[PDB]
Amino acid sequence: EKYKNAEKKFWHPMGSSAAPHRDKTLVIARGDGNYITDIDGQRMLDGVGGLWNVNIGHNRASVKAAIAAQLDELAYYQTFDGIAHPRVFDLAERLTGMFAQERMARVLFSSGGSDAVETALKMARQYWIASGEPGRTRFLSLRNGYHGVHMGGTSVGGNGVYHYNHGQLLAGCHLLDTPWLYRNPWDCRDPQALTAHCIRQLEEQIALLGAQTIAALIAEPVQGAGGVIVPPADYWPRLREVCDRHGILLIADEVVTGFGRSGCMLGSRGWGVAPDILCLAKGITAGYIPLGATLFNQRIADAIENGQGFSHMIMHGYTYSGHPTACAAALAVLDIVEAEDLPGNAAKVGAQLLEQLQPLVERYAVVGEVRGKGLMIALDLVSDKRTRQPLDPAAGQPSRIADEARRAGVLVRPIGNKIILSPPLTLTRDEAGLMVSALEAAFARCG
Amino acid sequence: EKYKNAEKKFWHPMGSSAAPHRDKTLVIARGDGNYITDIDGQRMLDGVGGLWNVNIGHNRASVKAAIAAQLDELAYYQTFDGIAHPRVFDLAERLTGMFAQERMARVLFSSGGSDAVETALKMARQYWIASGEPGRTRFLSLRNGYHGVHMGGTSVGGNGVYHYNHGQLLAGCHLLDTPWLYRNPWDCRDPQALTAHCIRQLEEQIALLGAQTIAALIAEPVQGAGGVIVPPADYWPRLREVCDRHGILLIADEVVTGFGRSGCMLGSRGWGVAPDILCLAKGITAGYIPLGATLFNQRIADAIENGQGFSHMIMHGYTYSGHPTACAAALAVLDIVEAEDLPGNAAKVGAQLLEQLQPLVERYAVVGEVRGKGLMIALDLVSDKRTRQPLDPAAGQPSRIADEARRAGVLVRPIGNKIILSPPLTLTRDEAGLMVSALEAAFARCG
Amino acid sequence: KYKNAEKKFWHPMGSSAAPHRDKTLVIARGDGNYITDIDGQRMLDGVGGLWNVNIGHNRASVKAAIAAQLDELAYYQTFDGIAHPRVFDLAERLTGMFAQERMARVLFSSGGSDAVETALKMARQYWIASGEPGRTRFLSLRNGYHGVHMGGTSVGGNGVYHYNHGQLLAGCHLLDTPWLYRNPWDCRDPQALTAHCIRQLEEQIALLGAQTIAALIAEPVQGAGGVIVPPADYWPRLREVCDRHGILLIADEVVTGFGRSGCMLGSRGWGVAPDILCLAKGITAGYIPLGATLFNQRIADAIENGQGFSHMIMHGYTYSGHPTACAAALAVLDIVEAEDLPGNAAKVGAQLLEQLQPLVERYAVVGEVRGKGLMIALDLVSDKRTRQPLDPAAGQPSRIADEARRAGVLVRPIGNKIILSPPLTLTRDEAGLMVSALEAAFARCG
Amino acid sequence: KYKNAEKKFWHPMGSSAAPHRDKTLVIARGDGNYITDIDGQRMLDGVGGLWNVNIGHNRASVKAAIAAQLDELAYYQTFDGIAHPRVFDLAERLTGMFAQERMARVLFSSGGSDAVETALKMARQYWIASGEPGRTRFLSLRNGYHGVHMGGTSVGGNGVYHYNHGQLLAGCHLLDTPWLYRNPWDCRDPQALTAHCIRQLEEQIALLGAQTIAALIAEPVQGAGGVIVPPADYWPRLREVCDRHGILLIADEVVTGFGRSGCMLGSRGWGVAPDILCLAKGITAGYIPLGATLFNQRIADAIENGQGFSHMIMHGYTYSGHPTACAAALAVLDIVEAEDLPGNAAKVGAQLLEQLQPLVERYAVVGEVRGKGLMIALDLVSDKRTRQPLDPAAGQPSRIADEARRAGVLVRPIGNKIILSPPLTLTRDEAGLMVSALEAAFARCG
């Protein structure tokens, strides 16, 4: 196959479009199980899980059969006002049943995580208007938080790299510090003291703005793309409490943590917390078909459906909201997740994997720390152990380590100064050891 | 089946969430060709084409086989920085080739039309920053224009119904009147005289704002959801001229008109105009798999890839950008479009259909006019002929007319006071006749 | 000897580029309706300072009032629970003058931009106190001018004030102005033009949603935008459409306030009571900076009865209610009513507009000259059939203005228009002097 | 007969609700550093008007300057190409006094909110003339106060001025203030606190991108936020971090300007030259409303050399450069320098701060007393360990103030803090009188 010399007419998301870098490509040809093979026939463990989303593994027959079945019946029809089809009923009933613990009542379907976030922001605005409180407009989010790249979700993202090239977006969006033990304004390495600092900052910000102007707070139960930041255990419970003091809606961004990666069917549930809104994508279809979903609890659902006048008009949604093929594939994916206890496998093998990575910290100066929860882990590379200053990605050392890991048979993901591990949730003890061995080799080479 | 009494745990886009309207459902079970069947076994012509997107018809074998083939090889992998797969190469190559007339150079893929708009807006901002002119940030668009429901695309929409429930959105978006012969501020029923009014208004707005602050103008070559507003023939050729006068980027939202619906492979091409950015979705995969695409010409592409410093880093994109299964299906769909000359069939049967609907205007007082181009047509219903004041949808007569058409075997779409016709582009003379008859019956019963 | 002096200040509304910046007409003295430059040359003050020296320069009684107050209390604050005699007097006086508009409370300031900014922020507070925090958007007119604070800039209808300052307040929307000379419909019938504009206003409200619209702001006669006199039925309809939607109507009376257009209020001159009044300029006849924003009983009752923090008025200025400015204002209002200055403005202004019409006939560059009372503008165009404005960058409007001064009458070029706005004490034959000086100016530089 | 009079104005910064609305201390006369109410009771003016009557009330020379100018030319405009003697004089005077700070141009206005708005809008214009219109965002500090125009409100660091007005200007970002008594780090070491705050600022710049940031605005001593005196190394680092990125440093000197904190500029007292100066209040000692915004050579050269429309300054006010205000300003600046009022404030302020320390020891409700020169605040708390501020809505800070007045000294409650800011001519005897009256007030109402 001659894709090696092929000219590139598309743009890589999240990469330099400048030559000559633009012309480098790792071209993946085939995937099966938790392994992928490039156009050069070299095979590597898929330590990134696609983009933490191929959580059941590549080429699952049952899911492929579900898609084929639905295509023969009805690949697509719309669900706009008064029209629907069987598959959207099935998954909406299914999703609300799985998250009854969070009193979720209604689903607004979409095609991806940014859709789910964009939907959560605009519908949070609608909830307050239907409740007779149109002053509730502002949004809170956390540093290093990532919520997609639609303009709404871009506006609440806590990493500047996604902002710089696009100008002023939504006004009235405010950032809070994240409870990050490795790097935080207080140099605080104690979890209870760090949670308390962050919550006190949150109350002060709420008071300054006036709670009556704030529509929602959005947060990832484990911050993924920002560097696998695992908050302290009491942070999310005290998040829920503070939002309740002011009636502020709590949006859990579960796009990455949804359906098991961190050890629980929800990251918010894993912390013992019921948010007001759930945002889901990625693993929901295990990447097989684009699908996103935003779930709303009974509180929000009741207000909007009883809203007066135009406030009960839901003028938001997508041509492919509730896509029959997408739903069909989703149902098959959820069956595997529950049947094979993929949340349980993630909690077990992830801990084992995290344990095996700790000696890297002592062995290699460039390894600052290794953190994780379930099967999301980040290796934080620093230039200085004492000050925890990140490596500069422009020097290119993190991708060089990544390349050598790949040559050793395991694809992992550099983001800035951090190597992300996010394999399928079916990862075994054996494969977890393979990942350990390849990173050890990469740091011996390029550490 | 027992979906008739079933509980509804999802929200219909573009509809009242209030009871009792919420509990009523037309549940479509199966599709073949241009016909759909509901859970009560009633067959009807798909006069809406899903949501003007199933342009080749339901249950096309070739497309399903292309989907299955790709699932066996690699259903999904990412295309983030330096990583890709064969299908995204093929489809990006194919698209730039189909639109070489427009000098299209790069594609940023996504999953739907709202993505395609959001991406064009955000990347237009990056174009100007990379070209060293970050003061170029504002957006122009048209009244009645519809561009999706992400916060960006919502900000530039020209119909208030999408704005009311969501608060303040993106600043610096400015609306222009649309060259709509039936209803316009000048009561102008002469095409050249109306184009002059609107272009003159556009010049005045640019002068008022300052061209150096204006990034792009976005417009549909035929306005779809705003009511099938067909601009005068010189309108778009004069849009291009004015945008060129000031260096403003012209974004053609081709989500509906893209790939043949209005009689040409592009609506902008159909007016003889090469825009700078294309927004595509819907028919690109004929709805079988969610896919969106935004194309950028060489001008924009060279500028961004040659941008200094951080301006050549494209930190915008999606988990499912370049989805292999979506691309595989898209490639199969484009074969049919060109092989069966689907734009030409749309021009021909569309004209025939439009001609056959004209006697409705004389026969039914409630019919104000019937307009269209290709296989997008709208019947504009009024209460008063001389003032052309729209029927109020809250009275429900347009929905009653739509229902009666369905009972006569043709599903059509009420939007506001207008009945939208947008069936598959494979529509035959025979099927067009059934649509005329079903409307004639509907207007006899509920007109 | 200020002629060669180096200039360490910036002229508002002018080129800061060299060498243009280095020129100066330095006014040394003022008395009555005349001024004297540093070269001892006198001229009629055809601009009235900046349409604000409406009683004339060097009125003894006003200076006597200022001296009296300085001896007693030049300044004290009027923040929560503290005030002084003069602010009681002036607030009582202003609310008395505008009982026809049901004015109940005054929030004082120092200028027109202050008053507009105050009207905008307090409109926001009114709705919040009324339990409707969704009411935030603002409407205003094309060519409208409302000062240069960021709020007032955001609602300005002329681009020249926007270009150099970036993104300001969101949710501000412009409407076309009912200008018979130039409008989007090329409508030359006043009744048809008002109908065009109101229909557009109704359309904009529906597009935006009235429940999101806080207020509409408009000048009864648009001054700096070029003396655009609206049709007589425009302002009554305006009031009615806003009442349809509960939208507050802010009348910008900074220029028209106290008589220039023939009535103590332009809004009253059209028979309309707005919800908020913006006043400045003539309120003290320019002798001391003062501004005022007045609110009707509707607004006052809502804010003063607001729940919790919503009745806290956390807006105001160090010099809100300044005693000496108030002292001066009281003396100025005495003269305005005693000498019926609105009545003189109507009568002599009409006379003057009549005397200026032959200029249009004689000089191609004169497109039209319009006015109401003692605000008048001559519209200079490059083409009669297209009404295309003269380009100010060519400098012809500046050159006609210079020759008028050489003929003894100082006038004001704004863009392509010459503005006439002398004191409201103008006499029948000072108006004759103005006609002769312009005729000379257009003969020389037309 | 004003006590029973109906109140037709609104007090800024106070409840407009009945029955609070109609309680009023009516000041009738002012002379020296004392004021007299309508009941003939005199009290020391511990608030200085509103920290602006810095030379005292009823200064003969200043009154004479005002009268002299009124006889000559009370007002004329300074818009494009027109000016008058007094504005030249004061512009030259101000740029000379601040030659150390390289100040080059003045844009005059009428108050502190004007001066702030002008600094913000011209900061936007500077970057446009420099070819960098992407520079739009503004930084400021928590508890910082910069007036009540929509611009200045947008950068304000206290919620109380925001709650009733909805969404204002976007792209304004707040930084924590280096306040040793209350800070997010509970940091009680001044060097360590400066390090926390500068580290935070570097993080903010990185997240936003320096190329999007137009200016940072801050008071050299934060006034209305509670007299927060920064550590001595804070402002030097502010300058240095701003210089790393070309970000403009706006010093809000409305209160600290001309001596209150011991120096002609607060920024100068920290050894720093900002790019922009905002001045008001004491500039005329309250006698006539005046504000001024000064710009350094850097900004002046860029704007005056800007291409095309970028050198047109379409910002300014009818009363920009008001002659009578300038005349008074010149007379006041003579007194400020001749009587070394910055030094008197430094010496008597220190003395007063020391003498106020025994109050802290004696009354639980006094959390701490801080100050620099003659701006001092007593910080009232409900609990000494948690530093929780007193709630102003409970009214105890006002009751304490009321008894202080009854003891002959007028002081100012703002929130939970009693502000002392008397004229800069304060004598050791009067400083002791202020201590004696506060000691009495806390014995009664503490």
Ligand SMILES: Cc1ncc(COP(=O)(O)O)c(CN)c1O
């Ligand atoms: C937490 C979270 N939020 C939102 C998104 C956006 O998802 P998508 O790429 O499907 O648009 C992502 C993508 N990584 C995410 O990690």
Ligand SMILES: Cc1ncc(COP(=O)(O)O)c(CN)c1O
């Ligand atoms: C012109 C246009 N652009 C954008 C969109 C958004 O498409 P999607 O629903 O797939 O997001 C639509 C959908 N009707 C559209 O009509």
Ligand SMILES: Cc1ncc(COP(=O)(O)O)c(CN)c1O
């Ligand atoms: C109509 C109007 N409103 C407000 C203003 C602003 O007044 P000031 O310059 O005193 O701030 C002006 C001054 N031209 C004005 O003409």
Ligand SMILES: Cc1ncc(COP(=O)(O)O)c(CN)c1O
């Ligand atoms: C620091 C500061 N900034 C600006 C202002 C606004 O001043 P003014 O009241 O004259 O508008 C104030 C008012 N106290 C101030 O203290």
